[PDB]
């Protein structure tokens, strides 16, 4: 899984090297940034439910047809709405995993790999999840470098969907 530390190791191992000061500096950057990262991850975790519920409505307001149009891909039945909130929670949970791990590793492995084929096969529009992510980004209530950390991983998600 890609983190600053595994990237430092991978860099040294690829060339049969012992770690050097070149890589230790990189890890120190991870340790220093962890203070803001943890703060962001804790806050999103503590407020996850309201963010999930708020983001789901943001989608339904942007795309009203998702709650009326008939089909298993839509949130027009109680099951569909449960699938949708579930998915939103997955995205948000992955963001907190990236913050804690210090890198995109968690999202890369669990969510981004295969995303396009899942959205094509199941008739899911990337535009729905971008709206949800845009909502979380605007209403998580973080400031300073905690917001910079959160938004960096949220914008990473939006890019994978674009």
């Amino acid at each position: 899984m890609k983190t600053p530390i595994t990237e430092a190791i991978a860099a040294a191992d690829t060339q049969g090297r012992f770690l050097s000061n070149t890589e230790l500096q990189a890890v120190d950057g991870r340790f220093k940034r962890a203070v803001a990262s943890m703060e962001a991850a804790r806050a999103l975790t503590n407020n996850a439910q309201s963010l999930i519920d708020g983001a789901a409505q943001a989608v339904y307001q942007k795309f009203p047809y998702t709650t009326t149009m008939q089909g298993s891909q839509y949130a027009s039945t109680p099951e569909g709405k449960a699938k949708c909130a579930r998915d939103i929670g997955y995205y948000l949970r992955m963001v907190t995993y990236c913050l804690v791990a210090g890198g995109t590793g968690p999202m890369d492995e669990y969510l981004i790999a295969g995303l396009s084929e899942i959205n094509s096969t199941f008739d899911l529009s990337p535009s729905w999840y971008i709206e949800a992510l845009k909502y979380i980004k605007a209403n998580h209530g973080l400031t300073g470098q905690a917001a910079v950390e959160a938004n960096a991983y949220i914008d990473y998600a939006i890019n994978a969907l674009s």
Partner: protein, 172 residues
């Protein structure tokens, strides 16, 4: 390859759960101990050649049959391979120290190594002795109280000792 942080993530995701307050606090402490960890890694790496050589010399002094004609470390080719293995093991041990997790050591170094040695005729018990000596010197270097802010690294030294014993257990 996982580090201490990704390991928690991978365990939390298998449950489909956000991190708990206990987990958050457990990972904040790792960060707060990061300086000591980097020192240990910098210290052992900066003396890698001495640890290897001095452990090799000691092994051959205690087990002279490895270097006598017919021994597994006789001829410069085999001697070079032997020293190489010692560097390799020490290298992946320092990888584990920095990551805070043994996965890199298990997957890239200790996996199938016991079988490699049995097919070649290399005595794994002698490799373990070589590993135990690198350990003693590595800890002695890493925990040297000179030229460093005073503090307690005992928990860290216990962890490092674990990675070495793991490698020794894997080859024997």
């Amino acid at each position: 390859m996982l580090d201490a942080f990704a390991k928690v993530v991978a365990q939390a995701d298998a449950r489909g759960e956000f991190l708990t307050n206990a987990q958050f606090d457990a990972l904040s402490n790792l960060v707060k101990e990061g300086n000591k960890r980097l020192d240990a890694v910098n210290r052992i790496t900066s003396n890698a050649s001495t640890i290897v050589a001095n452990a090799a010399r000691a092994l051959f002094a205690e087990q002279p049959q490895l270097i006598q004609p017919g021994g597994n470390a006789y001829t410069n080719r085999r001697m070079a391979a032997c020293l190489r293995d010692m560097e390799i093991i020490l290298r992946y041990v320092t990888y584990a120290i920095l990551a805070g997790d043994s996965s890199v050591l298990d997957d890239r170094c200790l996996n199938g190594l016991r079988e490699t040695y049995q097919a070649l005729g290399t005595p794994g018990s002698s490799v373990a002795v070589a590993i135990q000596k690198m350990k003693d010197a590595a800890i002695a270097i890493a925990n040297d109280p000179n030229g460093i802010t005073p503090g307690d690294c005992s928990a860290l030294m216990s962890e490092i000792a674990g990675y070495f014993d793991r490698a020794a257990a894997a080859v024997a």
